[PDB]
Amino acid sequence: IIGGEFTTIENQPWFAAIYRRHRGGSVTYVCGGSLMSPCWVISATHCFIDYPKKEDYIVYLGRSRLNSNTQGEMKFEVENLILHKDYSADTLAHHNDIALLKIRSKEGRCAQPSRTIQTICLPSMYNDPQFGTSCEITGFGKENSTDYLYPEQLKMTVVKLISHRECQQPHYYGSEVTTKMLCAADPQWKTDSCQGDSGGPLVCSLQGRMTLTGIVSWGRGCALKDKPGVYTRVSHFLPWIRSHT
Numbered sequence: 001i002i003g004g005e006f007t008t009i010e011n012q013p014w015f016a017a018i019y020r021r022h023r024g025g026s027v028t029y030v031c032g033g034s035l036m037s038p039c040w041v042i043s044a045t046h047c048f049i050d051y052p053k054k055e056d057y058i059v060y061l062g063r064s065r066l067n068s069n070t071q072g073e074m075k076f077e078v079e080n081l082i083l084h085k086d087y088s089a090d091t092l093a094h095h096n097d098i099a100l101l102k103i104r105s106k107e108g109r110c111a112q113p114s115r116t117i118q119t120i121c122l123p124s125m126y127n128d129p130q131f132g133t134s135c136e137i138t139g140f141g142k143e144n145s146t147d148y149l150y151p152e153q154l155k156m157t158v159v160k161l162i163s164h165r166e167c168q169q170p171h172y173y174g175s176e177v178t179t180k181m182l183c184a185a186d187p188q189w190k191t192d193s194c195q196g197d198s199g200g201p202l203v204c205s206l207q208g209r210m211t212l213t214g215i216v217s218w219g220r221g222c223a224l225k226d227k228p229g230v231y232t233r234v235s236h237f238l239p240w241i242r243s244h245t
């Protein structure tokens, strides 16, 4: 995240941190996830499109720091990895960038809810907040583009959603942003999402309830003028999310 505030998992009980083991031993961090139900998690496919092996990942439902066992955590494995069957990635625009990582502990169990481990809500057919609506995003991503190290503590920020036609202007994304994408950003461009926060939760507060509206996907740079962050329009994929769970 760029700027923003340092939070803790207790404030984002549905945030899952996805790791990957290497042939050798080392374990580095990959992307962010959202817990939909005990046995499931939803992210983005570009995080896994290069190593489609389920045995390669590790997910955390309760970790505050990147190299620490923040009280109350639980370690998981990926029982099933379902990628959207038509993913493609252009120069910037990432098509059908949504995925499913069915978790399971070594004993064979799913997520066990607590003050720290909870889940967010699925949207409904044709119902996304109207532009201008502020929402939040959580992630261990970069703080400044000019870095090579992810922040040792989880961060969070607020951004405003932008209309479709506004994000489709020439000095923005043009026609590289379809209807199945959302755009959001600080109107002063000081805070934003960046590499590492990919695949994380874009939570808007729709109708009193917190909802997983977007999914960190792509974006030109990080916090650049007239260059919002793009997100997958979660709602649209209801008949998909549904038919595979």
Ligand SMILES: CC(C)C1=NCCc2ccc(NC(=O)c3ccc4cc(C(=N)N)ccc4c3)cc21
Pocket: 046, 047, 049, 050, 192, 193, 194, 195, 196, 197, 198, 216, 217, 218, 219, 220, 221, 222, 223, 228, 229, 230
């Ligand atoms: C693992 C890496 C190299 C990788 N592999 C598959 C293809 C691929 C696509 C995008 C990325 N992610 C990024 O590098 C990447 C870069 C910039 C990003 C910027 C935003 C944003 N502007 N809010 C939001 C998300 C962002 C993600 C990495 C890969």
